[PDB]
């Protein structure tokens, strides 16, 4: 099954963090990196001068069950990032989000797929559209259609 995973960083040299995360994802058992997007720059909201985030998307072919993949992504986040509790409400070292898992719809306390609110997040949809322009969501909505109907500015590359 192809899993689409979002990667975000805005601390401790994001280009390094995203590359470290790609290496870690690529190493997850019975999984293989199919496609990686370009790296996008996501400015902070608000006048406050916080660090920009680097955002990317990866297509990962995997034979793992969805919650098994989550076990690995959470492991990677905890080992590589999540240094301070404050990262929860602010800039963070590494954020790995499972956006989609084939055509699966999953609603558990651990795992919700498609990822919460992802259709309203340009920093997810742009890199996703780069790697899967013909993608259709589990509800039948085309990704391309979402980008023609929702108010997103085009994110610059990193
Ligand atoms: Cl850089
Ligand atoms: Cl959906
Ligand atoms: Mg391997
Ligand atoms: Mg996130
Ligand atoms: Mg997250």
Biggest β-sheet: count, sense, barrel?
5 strands, antiparallel
Order of helices and strands: EHEEEHEEEHH
Amino-to-carboxy terminus distance = 29 Å
Quantity of strands, as a count: 7
Q: What general form does the structure show? A: globular
CATH structural fold name: Alpha-Beta Plaits
Kindly give the count of domains: 1
Q: What does this entry look like structurally?
A:
This protein is of the alpha+beta class and 158 residues long. The chain has helices at residues 14-26, 66-80, 122-131, 143-149; strands at residues 2-9, 31-36, 40-42, 53-62, 95-101, 106-107, 112-113. It has a single domain, classed as 7,8-Dihydro-6-hydroxymethylpterin-pyrophosphokinase HPPK (Alpha-Beta Plaits, 2-Layer Sandwich), CATH 3.30.70. Strands 1, 2, 3, 4 and 5 form a five-stranded antiparallel β-sheet that branches. It has a two-stranded antiparallel ribbon with strand order 6-7. Helix 1 (14-26) runs antiparallel to helix 2. The structure holds chloride ion (CL) (2 copies) and magnesium ion (3 copies). Residues 95, 97 line the site of one magnesium ion.
SSE topology sketch:
Blueprint: E1 2-9, H1 14-26, E2 31-36, E3 40-42, E4 53-62, H2 66-80, E5 95-101, E6 106-107, E7 112-113, H3 122-131, H4 143-149
Antiparallel strand pairs: 1-4, 1-5, 2-4, 3-4, 6-7
Helix pairs in contact: 1-2
The structure holds chloride ion (2 copies) and magnesium ion (3 copies).
